Amino acid sequence: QRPERIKTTPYLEGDVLSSDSGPLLSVFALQEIMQKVRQVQADYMTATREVDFTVPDVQKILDDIKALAAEQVYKIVKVPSISFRHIVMQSRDRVLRVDTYYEEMSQVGDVITEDEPEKFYSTIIKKVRFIRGKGSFILHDIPTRDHRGMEVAEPEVLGVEFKNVLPVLTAEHRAMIQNALDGSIIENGNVATRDVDVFIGACSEPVYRIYNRLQGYIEAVQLQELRNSIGWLERLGHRKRITYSQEVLTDFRRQDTIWVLALQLPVNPQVVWDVPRSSIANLIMNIATCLPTGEYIAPNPRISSITLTQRITTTGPFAILTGSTPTAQQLNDVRKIYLALMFPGQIILDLKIDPGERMDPAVRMVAGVVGHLLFTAGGRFTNLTQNMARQLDIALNDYLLYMYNTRVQVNYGPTGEPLDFQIGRNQYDCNVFRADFATGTGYNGWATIDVEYREPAPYVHAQRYIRYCGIDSRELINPTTYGIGMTYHCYNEMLRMLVAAGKDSEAAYFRSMLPFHMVRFARINQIINEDLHSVFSLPDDMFNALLPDLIAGAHQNADPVVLDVSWISLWFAFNRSFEPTHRNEMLEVAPLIESVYASELSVMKVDMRHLSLMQRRFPDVLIQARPSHFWKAVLNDSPEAVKAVMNLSHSHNFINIRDMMRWVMLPSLQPSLKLALEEEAWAAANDFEDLMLTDQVYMHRDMLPEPRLDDIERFRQEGFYYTNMLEAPPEIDRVVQYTYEIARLQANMGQFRAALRRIMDDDDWVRFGGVLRTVRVKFYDARPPDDVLQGLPFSYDTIKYATETTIFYLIYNVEFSNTPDSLVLINPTYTMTKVFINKRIVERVRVGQILAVLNRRFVAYKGKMRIMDITQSLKMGTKLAAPTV
Amino acid sequence: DHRGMEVAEPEVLGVEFKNVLPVLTAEHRAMIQNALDGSIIENGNVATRD
């Protein structure tokens, strides 16, 4: 139905030679890249590290990327998790309140040691991910109850567990607790048309931050963002000329539906193109996702020869070449040539040399003429290297001077360069066909505008238009000249020089074949400008800088891929045309893939940026650290598909720490819900007391208390207990500060223990600050082992400065058969280690303050509401009823 | 690695002294270790290659 493919004359009718597509060509290009390096390292002696240059499955990688967009980072629950529990002692009016968050927090990750920085980074990452996961939830359909004409919440949704306290309480205390429980109301519960449930409950602060952030994101991201994404999709579809169905999307919303949209579709290309050594991978992904499928078409046989009578027929100048058929290797070379043509600047060609090959000399001489008309060699971009241009010039020189007919006059110049002569009776100057990459003379860019700029593109980083041979794709629908008027400068000059050199049959052949050649390049221009537009396209500035960097021989961050072809492949490629038939299967779902990839990259970069400041914040923990340590720690906890995409060309084996650090400090990011939650988790984790890590570890000599059991019941009512938790840090006038270096020097000189002993006999304190330490919490109803009461903050290997410390709470239990001085011993029992945390992990409260933790506002959806995820709806081929402007 | 800078291993320095270490005193061992920690590797450049 496309008017470009309508054919009214039999000139453009040809046989189908072969067919090719995008998923085939991506794998073919990867294999051709890897085989070259393998063979080169096989032929010559090489000193390098071992790398296995394998080729992966691109289709499975793309499928995994698609599957990655269906996973959610939130969950729906009916009640929140418990945040506070209680411990009942022998007292009837005093209990212990324990904040559980720190209790599960202290058990996440590995033990911190100075000798392994990578494990330290991994532990920090696990703790942050635990914080993020613990708080991403949505409340839905909570259980309520009616009470004296109003709605109250069930005790099981309040987030605090206290049921084990009720049997021991008195009647008055039980009545008070019951009244306090009944005071927990549902906001404006007597309204029939209500939409949410609001109440007051208990939660920890880091969890509450994530809960609030998720609630706000759900509230804010709605219809308008969806409309913006669909509008950008419409603009891209208009650029790519897709077909639309008749149904349109309406802004109607049901009053019982809640949308969740986790991705914003317009992607920043800087995020994609900032990945180090990622040009080849981006090229492969562009080929795999955007290239259409089509066939190769041979020219009409009537163009070459004419029959006048049954036995009278005109003979063609290239009969032997037009009768030949390619081999498999020559077909692969033709595919390489078309790959180079469809990606200007990014892929360039060179000459393959095979001494075992035996071919007619005329093949090279014909390819010399063909290559000048087939390729662009300067001005703005290039399809080929300077060496191949030199070889083509030499081949053209040899073709022009070989006169199998009557000779013509030749006047050589003083210089010995090829094509330095005048030819024919009109003395045509052949110096203009020698390559010069600055001006582009002698090739398709000669006196032609190759790159054009027009109205702004859907992708902001790629604005250019490619106009090979100066012909527009619109010329196939609304021509400019007649049938004989189609020409351009280089082709015309080549025809004139062929005529001047006495080669008339060849000039007639090329004059006949010119419209076919120009139509082929129009098709190529259309394919480049419409089908291949994506975020994996090369940015404009890099494209502009490709050619001067090649001429000057400078370092390139986007070094072009070089492929080698044979001589006869040029002739085979000149006599074909690629005609697309079907669009790529993945065209409509590509932007979602691009968005997922960019969002995951942004999350990884944020994690690495936050880890990069650790050594400056704690130098004594990370003495033996490198940037590669947190690099590997972050990539150990990333999705496999993203790593597979980044590692297509095995760039992970060759990047250095300078590349890592320059990537970390780049500012570009891609927003998403996962990124917002991760950043909130990092903001919570900026306080290291929330990770159960500290350096406020002290030593002081204390003895376990030995109370008098004069009255058993009165002592029981006290709720006596002992702990090494400190309420306040000790006074500065009685603390001796130690560092890691001083302590280790005094340990090597064998005089550290004497210093510690001398300090301890003076009733002073010692602080082992400077290094972070892992902290555990334990509870005991009896006398603990000597491991914990005599646990020193160091150990002897030379010493180890850090060692996990245990904060213990010891509860004293006595019976009626206890003698008033039964616990008194003849000698004291000493304890040494104390910790200051500045959090209320454990607290002794009266039974009148049990429900004082209810201070968090929760908003829950009612059972009539539905929560749906609409991220899958971001596909290219849909239309809005009211378009966005 | 040592405190953000890169130092070379003793087996590339071109001098062998592993048989002397067992008979040193504590102060001599500390002095030797401190001296070893000060062999810094610089980042050079030949023909635009670091």
Side-chain angles (χ1 to χ4, degrees), chain A residues 373-384:
Chain A
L373 307 174
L374 206 54
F375 300 120
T376 298
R380 281 81 65 193
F381 62 89
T382 178
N383 293 119
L384 61 83

Side-chain angles (χ1 to χ4, degrees), chain A residues 65-76:
Chain A
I65 293 278
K66 293 187 286 185
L68 194 59
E71 286 161 334
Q72 299 167 10
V73 302
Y74 56 93
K75 59 182 183 286
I76 300 159

Side-chain angles (χ1 to χ4, degrees), chain A residues 128-188:
Chain A
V128 171
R129 291 288 169 84
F130 166 82
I131 280 175
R132 169 160 80 81
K134 206 50 160 51
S136 310
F137 67 97
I138 308 168
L139 292 161
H140 187 206
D141 196 16
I142 65 166
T144 77
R145 183 170 101 268
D146 291 350
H147 189 224
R148 63 170 169 85
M150 67 182 182
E151 259 185 44
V152 302
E154 294 293 328
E156 59 250 40
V157 68
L158 296 175
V160 55
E161 183 178 1
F162 62 97
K163 299 298 293 295
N164 57 321
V165 183
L166 296 183
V168 65
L169 294 174
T170 77
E172 304 86 335
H173 287 303
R174 254 194 289 282
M176 273 154 207
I177 301 299
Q178 191 58 59
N179 272 3
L181 278 174
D182 288 344
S184 288
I185 62 170
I186 300 293
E187 265 290 284
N188 64 7

Side-chain angles (χ1 to χ4, degrees), chain A residues 344-539:
Chain A
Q346 302 179 79
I347 298 172
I348 58 182
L349 300 173
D350 205 12
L351 185 68
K352 182 67 181 294
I353 277 175
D354 184 86
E357 180 174 55
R358 203 174 70 171
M359 206 81 51
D360 195 53
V363 176
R364 181 186 79 107
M365 288 196 297
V366 171
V369 179
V370 162
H372 280 71
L373 307 174
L374 206 54
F375 300 120
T376 298
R380 281 81 65 193
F381 62 89
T382 178
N383 293 119
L384 61 83
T385 71
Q386 288 170 307
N387 186 61
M388 184 177 177
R390 190 78 181 182
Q391 300 297 323
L392 283 169
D393 294 341
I394 288 163
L396 180 66
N397 189 359
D398 287 1
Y399 183 74
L400 294 172
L401 290 180
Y402 176 59
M403 319 194 180
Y404 63 92
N405 266 289
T406 313
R407 299 180 76 205
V408 299
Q409 175 87 246
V410 188
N411 291 312
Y412 296 98
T415 301
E417 294 293 328
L419 303 162
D420 192 25
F421 49 82
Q422 272 94 353
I423 193 66
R425 64 209 209 90
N426 53 339
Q427 319 280 26
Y428 195 91
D429 182 26
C430 303
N431 271 277
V432 296
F433 279 93
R434 196 164 57 248
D436 175 62
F437 275 52
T439 65
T441 176
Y443 287 85
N444 273 337
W446 187 7
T448 302
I449 297 93
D450 283 314
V451 183
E452 190 152 80
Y453 291 99
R454 299 183 192 164
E455 76 270 20
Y459 286 102
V460 72
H461 78 297
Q463 309 279 337
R464 67 192 166 278
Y465 275 78
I466 302 299
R467 185 179 67 189
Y468 272 123
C469 297
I471 190 167
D472 191 354
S473 299
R474 295 198 73 262
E475 295 282 309
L476 302 171
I477 313 283
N478 189 358
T480 300
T481 52
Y482 291 95
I484 62 170
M486 285 179 50
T487 188
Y488 62 104
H489 184 64
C490 178
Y491 210 103
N492 195 57
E493 292 300 317
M494 179 90 234
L495 287 175
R496 294 221 303 137
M497 182 179 72
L498 276 173
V499 167
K503 295 187 157 64
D504 306 290
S505 298
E506 294 89 330
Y509 174 82
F510 286 114
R511 187 173 284 114
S512 301
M513 278 285 284
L514 173 54
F516 173 88
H517 166 88
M518 278 170 86
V519 162
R520 153 175 71 209
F521 267 121
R523 304 278 192 206
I524 288 165
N525 281 343
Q526 179 159 284
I527 290 168
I528 291 171
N529 289 334
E530 291 175 354
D531 291 331
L532 287 176
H533 197 65
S534 65
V535 68
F536 300 115
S537 299
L538 194 71

Side-chain angles (χ1 to χ4, degrees), chain A residues 662-696:
Chain A
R662 68 180 65 252
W663 191 60
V664 167
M665 304 208 304
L666 289 156
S668 302
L669 287 180
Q670 177 66 26
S672 60
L673 169 60
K674 197 182 176 182
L675 179 57
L677 295 178
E678 193 83 19
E679 283 275 32
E680 188 63 42
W682 275 112
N686 269 319
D687 185 8
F688 262 66
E689 293 179 353
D690 281 322
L691 306 186
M692 294 301 286
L693 306 171
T694 196
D695 66 30
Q696 294 273 337

Side-chain angles (χ1 to χ4, degrees), chain A residues 88 311 421 437 455 468 500 589 782 862 866:
Chain A
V88 177
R311 61 209 155 198
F421 49 82
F437 275 52
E455 76 270 20
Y468 272 123
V589 292
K862 303 200 85 177
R866 302 147 69 225

